[PDB]
């Protein structure tokens, strides 16, 4: 149901070994841990959740961009990139990273 893809605009490559955490918004208005992982050699993170687990609600995908850049020896601007969205009854969250800029797009298919 949910997958995350990360690309590096400086090196022209997948962004490998990027930490990603996914949160669901609780009735509290606080963010509850939901799923996490490390992007693969292809820049992708599969297996985050299942159909039965991934209910309607408000989700946050936090991509640890600052750690990624530091591991490359490159100086970054952002602490992270947070992507917040409502799931309404397959989602791909894609991000393209530069040191002082990022973009994110959702690809939503049937």
Residues near ligand WLX (CB under 6 A): 94-96, 103-105
Closest CA to 85 of 64, 106, 109: 106
Q: What's the min distance (Å) between Cβ of 105 and a copy of itself?
A: 4
Is 38 annotated in some ligand binding site? no
Task: Write the DSSP string, 2-21.
Answer: EEEEEEETTTTEE-TT-EEE
CA atoms in the 13 A half-sphere facing the CB of 108: 7
Q: Which does 83 bind (CB under 5 to 8 A by kind): a copy of itself, Ca ion, ligand WLX, none?
A: a copy of itself
Q: Residue 40 annotated as binding?
A: no
* Among 88, 108, 110, 84, CA closest to 3: 108
Looking at residues 29 to 88 of the shown chain, list those that interact with Ca ion (rule: CB under 5 A): none
Q: Phi and psi (nearest 5°) for 64?
A: -80, 75
89 contributes a contact to Ca ion by CB under 5 A: yes
Site residues for a copy of itself, 55-94, by CB under 8 A, read 58, 77-80, 82-86
Footprint on this chain of a copy of itself (rule: CB under 8 A): 58, 77-80, 82-86, 96, 98, 100-108
Footprint on this chain of Ca ion (rule: CB under 5 A): 89
């Amino acid at each position: 149901p949910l997958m995350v893809k990360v690309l590096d605009a400086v090196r022209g490559s997948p962004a490998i070994n990027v930490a990603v955490h996914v949160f669901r918004k609780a009735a509290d208005d606080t963010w509850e841990p939901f799923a996490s992982g490390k992007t693969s050699e292809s820049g992708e993170l599969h297996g985050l959740t299942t159909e039965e687990e991934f209910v309607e609600g408000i989700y946050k995908v936090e991509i640890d961009t600052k750690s990624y850049w530091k591991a490359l020896g490159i100086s970054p601007f952002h602490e992270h990139a947070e992507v917040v969205f409502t799931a309404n009854d397959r989602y791909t969250i894609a991000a393209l990273l530069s040191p002082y800029s990022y973009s994110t797009t959702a690809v939503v298919t049937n």
